[PDB]
């Protein structure tokens, strides 16, 4: 409520030299932005050095600070520090509070220096994705025809392996492929729960595809629409989306789209991968008729950004809901990036409501500003369930509405394994 109000009053200004921005960059030991040097007193609860006077900012290494987008975000996200301290003062046991912005920068309190190559991005974190959109029913279509052989195949294989990393245990996914005959890549044949084990099978099967044959969009899309109309197995009964990983072509497949989704209840996201000279006209047409988006991946560096921007389209119905879409969600147990052990994180999306009192913006107000976040460590929950009164054989445990244990004596602060490790 104090991020929607401050953002609305913000005035978009393009000159940052005469009026510098003061903030603490988390990953540091510049005209247009001033930097703070904190005191960093050691404190308990956390296992590091923190400063309770200001909030730190993390900016991804490929996101340039000093841009007109980042610097504009660093002013209206400065009244958050006064709400960060009020929350801490009322509840001294408060752990990390964080604002993951859609620009890419995460502002968290209390300030603490960031932990080889930093590949962290707040827009790919499990707690950000779960609040940026509703659960989905992704079905990936991969073009494995002859024209995609070579560099554009290893870019497709990496891209599919990177969008599977944006799917949680509440989403359902399957990967298909068409080379003049549509088939599955794995042993599944229908949508699976997309947990850690199932996604490993799809990733291993995707790495083993070979490019050979004739491109046929009609047969591939007929297979995709058939797999999204199963209803015999467990599903999400939510966002039904199709990702088409191709390079280019001359086929629009307008007959298939008029046969399977005349009401346009299934979104189609189309990706053009690699450097080529094939027509991208039909590829962009499937993304505009069907309520999707079109993305281009010309190299390895564009894989990460382009495979996570489909959540901006999926969040459009969530913003138009209004106050009904503001529900706190708790993620699964995961390990904190700033090492703190096993934690769960609360989540609340933030909307862009500039010009709301005038009732005519509807231009960038359909996207979210970011996702709120507050971390609760499993040790805090374990303190609310005293144990020493019971026998050594007695214990508590709690589970998700999935079977996953929130707290259990056999739950260790280590990642779960999904096969035999190997080294090449």
């Amino acid at each position: 409520l104090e991020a929607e109000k401050v953002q609305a009053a913000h005035q978009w200004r393009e000159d940052f030299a005469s009026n510098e921005v003061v903030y603490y960059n988390a990953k540091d030991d510049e005209p247009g932005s001033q930097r703070i040097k904190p005191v960093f007193i050691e404190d308990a609860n956390f296992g590091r050095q923190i400063s309770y006077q200001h909030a730190a900012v993390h900016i991804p290494t490929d996101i340039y600070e000093g841009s007109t987008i980042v610097l504009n975000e660093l002013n209206w996200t400065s009244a958050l520090d006064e709400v960060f301290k009020k929350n801490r003062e009322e509840d001294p046991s408060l752990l990390w509070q964080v604002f993951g912005s859609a620009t890419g920068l995460a502002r968290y309190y209390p300030a603490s220096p960031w932990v080889k190559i930093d590949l962290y991005d707040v827009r790919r974190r499990p707690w950000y994705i779960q609040g940026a959109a509703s659960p989905k029913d992704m079905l990936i279509l991969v073009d494995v025809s002859g024209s995609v052989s070579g560099l554009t195949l290893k870019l497709i294989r990496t891209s599919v392996s990177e969008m599977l990393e944006t799917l949680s245990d509440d989403d359902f996914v399957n990967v298909a492929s068409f080379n003049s005959n549509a088939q599955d890549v794995s042993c599944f044949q229908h949508l699976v729960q997309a947990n850690v084990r199932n996604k490993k099978v799809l990733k291993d099967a995707v790495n083993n595809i070979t490019a050979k044959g004739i491109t046929d969009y009609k047969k591939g899309f007929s297979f995709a629409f058939e797999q999204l109309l199963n209803y015999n197995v467990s599903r999400a009964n939510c966002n039904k989306i199709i990702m088409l990983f191709t390079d280019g072509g001359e086929e629009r497949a307008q007959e298939i789209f008029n046969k399977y989704n005349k009401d346009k209840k299934v979104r189609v996201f189309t990706f053009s991968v690699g450097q080529h000279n094939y027509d991208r006209g039909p590829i962009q047409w499937m993304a505009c008729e069907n309520k999707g988006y079109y993305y281009e991946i010309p190299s390895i560096g564009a894989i990460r950004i382009n495979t996570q921007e489909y959540l901006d389209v999926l969040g459009r119905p969530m913003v138009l809901a209004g106050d009904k879409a503001k529900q706190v969600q708790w993620t699964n147990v995961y390990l904190d990036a700033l090492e703190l052990g096993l934690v769960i994180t609360g989540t609340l999306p933030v909307f862009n409501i500039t010009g709301q009192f005038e009732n005519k913006t509807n231009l960038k107000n359909q996207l979210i500003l970011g996702v709120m976040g507050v971390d609760v460590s499993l040790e805090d929950i374990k303190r609310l369930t005293p144990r020493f009164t019971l026998c050594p054989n007695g214990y508590y445990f709690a589970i998700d509405p999935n079977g996953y244990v929130l707290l259990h004596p056999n739950l260790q602060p280590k990642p779960i394994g999904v096969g035999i490790p190997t080294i090449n």
Partner: peptide, 23 residues
């Protein structure tokens, strides 16, 4: 048991913002 909230197919959505409708 999955979540009981689902947010899609809102009529007031824009739909005119693809990545290729402009370029």
């Amino acid at each position: 048991k999955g979540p009981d909230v689902c947010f899609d197919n809102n009529v007031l959505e824009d739909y005119t913002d693809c990545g290729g409708v402009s370029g």
